[PDB]
């Protein structure tokens, strides 16, 4: 594949990935927080 298209991919699913998680966790801890507040 195109070194720049797979890297683009790669640099899109590699970063965006943990970043989604990071969003997931932030939203989780926020959820906890949102749940601990009630």
């Amino acid at each position: 594949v195109m070194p720049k298209q797979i890297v683009y991919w790669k640099q899109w699913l590699s970063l965006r990935n943990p970043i989604l998680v990071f969003l997931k966790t932030r939203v989780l801890k926020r959820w906890r927080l949102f749940s601990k507040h009630e």
Side-chain angles (χ1 to χ4, degrees):
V1 205
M2 261 279 283
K4 298 154 71 262
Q5 122 87 144
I6 38 57
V7 88
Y8 227 46
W9 254 112
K10 143 41 133 311
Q11 75 175 174
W12 196 103
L13 189 97
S14 224
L15 307 324
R16 278 309 194 161
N17 252 3
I19 294 201
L20 300 218
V21 151
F22 137 65
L23 277 266
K24 249 109 99 233
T25 169
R26 286 318 295 270
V27 145
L28 105 60
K29 72 177 231 195
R30 275 247 102 160
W31 238 94
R32 293 178 154 200
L33 276 248
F34 260 38
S35 232
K36 92 167 53 269
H37 129 96
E38 48 176 8

